[PDB]
Paper text:
Since the CP-binding motif of the [name] proteins is sufficient for the interaction with CP, peptides derived from this motif were used for the crystallographic studies; mouse [name] (residues 985–1005; referred to as CA21), human CD2AP (485–507; CD23), and human CKIP-1 (148–70; CK23) (we collectively refer to these synthetic peptides derived from [name] proteins as [name] peptides). Each elongated peptide binds along a continuous curved groove on the surface of the CP β-subunit. The consensus motif interacts with CP across the two domains: the N-terminus with the CP-L domain and the C-terminus with the CP-S domain. The conformations of CP within the CP/[name] peptide complexes are similar to each other (RMSDs; 0.71–0.90 Å) and are slightly different from either CPfull or CPβΔC (RMSDs; 0.97–1.26 Å), suggesting that, unlike V-1, the [name] peptides do not cause a large conformational change to CP. In contrast to these two peptides, CA21 does not contact CP via the C-terminal flanking region. Moreover, unlike CD2AP, the [name] residues immediately C-terminal to the motif do not contribute to the stable CP interaction, consistent with our structure in which CA21 does not contact CP in this region. CD23 and CK23 moderately inhibited barbed end capping by CP, while CA21 was a poor inhibitor. Surprisingly, CD23 and CK23, which possess substantial affinity for CP, strongly inhibited the CP/V-1 interaction, indicating that the peptides restrict the conformation of CP to the “low affinity to V-1” form. This inhibition depends on the CP/[name] peptide interaction because CA21, which has a lower CP binding affinity than the other peptides, exhibited minimal inhibition. A superposition of the crystal structures of the CP/[name] peptide complexes onto the EM model of the CP/actin filament structure clearly revealed that none of the peptides on CP overlap with the barbed end actin protomers.
The actin capping protein (CP) specifically binds to the barbed end of actin filaments with a high affinity and prevents the addition and loss of the monomers at this dynamic end. CP is a heterodimeric protein composed of α- and β-subunits and the molecule displays a pseudo two-fold symmetry due to the resemblance of the tertiary structures between the two subunits. CP caps the filament with its two independent actin binding sites at the C-terminus of each subunit (“tentacles”). V-1 and [name] proteins directly bind to CP and inhibit the filament capping activity of CP.
Residue numbers in the entry:
A (entry chain C): 985 to 1003
B (entry chain B): 2 to 244
C (entry chain A): 7 to 276
The structure:
Amino acid sequence: RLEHFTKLRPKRNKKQQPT
Amino acid sequence: SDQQLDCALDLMRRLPPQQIEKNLSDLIDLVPSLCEDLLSSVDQPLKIARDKVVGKDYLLCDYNRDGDSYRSPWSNKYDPPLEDGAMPSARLRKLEVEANNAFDQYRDLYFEGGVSSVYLWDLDHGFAGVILIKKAGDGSKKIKGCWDSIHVVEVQEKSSGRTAHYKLTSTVMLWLQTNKTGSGTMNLGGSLTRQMEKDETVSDSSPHIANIGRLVEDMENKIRSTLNEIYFGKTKDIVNGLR
Amino acid sequence: RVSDEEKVRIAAKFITHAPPGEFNEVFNDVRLLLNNDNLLREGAAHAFAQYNMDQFTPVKIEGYDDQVLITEHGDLGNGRFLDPRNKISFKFDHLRKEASDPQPEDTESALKQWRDACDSALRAYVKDHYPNGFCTVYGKSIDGQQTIIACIESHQFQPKNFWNGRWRSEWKFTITPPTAQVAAVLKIQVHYYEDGNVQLVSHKDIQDSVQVSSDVQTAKEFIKIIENAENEYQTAISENYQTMSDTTFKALRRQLPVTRTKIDWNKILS
């Protein structure tokens, strides 16, 4: 039902995921 | 797992925003495979860190994070120091410096205080950026107020460089808390998100930072008015409809 | 990583933190996230009952006027609840929110007359002050002290307009004639979620004392205290909305710069 606008924000690729 | 992400984002729209940080941490514990997607798509209150080189505050969020470190828009360095964290290209970094200076003036004109930060990143056929603003009222007021702006812009450049397509997705978080004799504890908090897109000419008279500045200003003004309507109008009318 | 028992604890926590009128949506989200239907049934059984009792869920028992609230005070164990007005217990289905199998029940009778007097007075009070409110009044001995517990609920659900709200109040009168000690908490939750998630969560604690006489004249004094305090709280909330709006909120951001026009972005970049 609800629209999720943040799904369509451009991804920023990181070098390392959180540890 | 588009389905799982959709359920996680729906849950964040429903769980009390007074617990927005614990909600996200609990969600990541519930579905650890979604961690990266959640850190990207779930907005959180902005935190402040000190850039020790310049004696200026900067803002933290997922968009300036790499590993467990954050990049300063003033020094262009990660803290704690990192080997080879995500960095804007040389030309994009120049734009990022220019955008930081423009948005610090914007912040002063509208917020008369607080902290701003802008972070850009390269895309395949353009770039994207986040413009962040944090303003807190005095926390000594037992009448606490905080404002977070999170404006994410995607800029798809065209071969000429005379037009670009801009997509703006903006969240404002507004938090108000009071503990008073008559009204007891009242906590009114949460966020609104809106989206818009536009093609604009890109030129020396209208460069990217001006085009982005106008879109951000238009959107933030609109959202401020909607916050006013919802917080102090709608939620109040609902309370009075209950009794 | 995270244990199954921790995952279902979190699942149960979320289910209990559903805003008013949005239990099913939260539940369906949590179900798909946990992606382990047999785990969810085991570890989050308690969650449905906990939610219903926390939220003062009103339920209709066919054949009896008005509605009764599902509350911790009415929990008899084994899925049954007390309706202290109709002196019956009933089975409550926490998933379907449906009452069944009414059976005669009496619990304690030191306070039968006081509970009935208070119930009668509170029913009129609630119908007059709330658009579609409900109440349930319990009488019980707690640590040798006779206590009347009055619970009030009122909600408005408009999910097609993306909002829901609920008021709950719980009033305890510990009766030690000629004094009754008063303890209450008033609670409000409102959720607005059109393109966002904004919630008001509010509560106020009340303490008071009243000199008591006969059951009917006392019930009258109790409702007067309830009315004054609830009216006062509602008044104060609306006054606080005004203060927040023209102090704190205005201080966070201007509508426009001091120039009273939008920014000249060309002056900015120079």
